[PDB]
Motif scaffolding. Structure first.
Motif, short mmCIF file in Angstrom:
data_model
loop_
_atom_site.label_atom_id
_atom_site.label_comp_id
_atom_site.label_asym_id
_atom_site.label_seq_id
_atom_site.Cartn_x
_atom_site.Cartn_y
_atom_site.Cartn_z
N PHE A 3 0.81 -1.21 0.00
CA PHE A 3 0.00 0.00 0.00
C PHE A 3 0.85 1.27 0.00
O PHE A 3 0.58 2.20 -0.76
N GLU A 4 1.85 1.31 0.86
CA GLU A 4 2.70 2.48 0.97
C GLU A 4 3.46 2.76 -0.32
O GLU A 4 3.62 3.91 -0.71
N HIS A 8 2.79 6.25 -1.74
CA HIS A 8 3.96 7.12 -1.81
C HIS A 8 3.73 8.24 -2.83
O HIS A 8 4.31 9.33 -2.71
N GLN A 9 2.88 7.99 -3.82
CA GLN A 9 2.59 8.99 -4.84
C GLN A 9 1.77 10.14 -4.24
O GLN A 9 1.70 11.22 -4.82
#
Length: 10
Positions: A3-4, A8-9
């Motif tokens: 998920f991260e 991150h976007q």
């Protein structure tokens, strides 16, 4: 983890 890498976007 996965998920991260995406979130991150922000």
């Amino acid at each position: 983890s996965r998920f991260e890498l995406i979130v991150h976007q922000r």
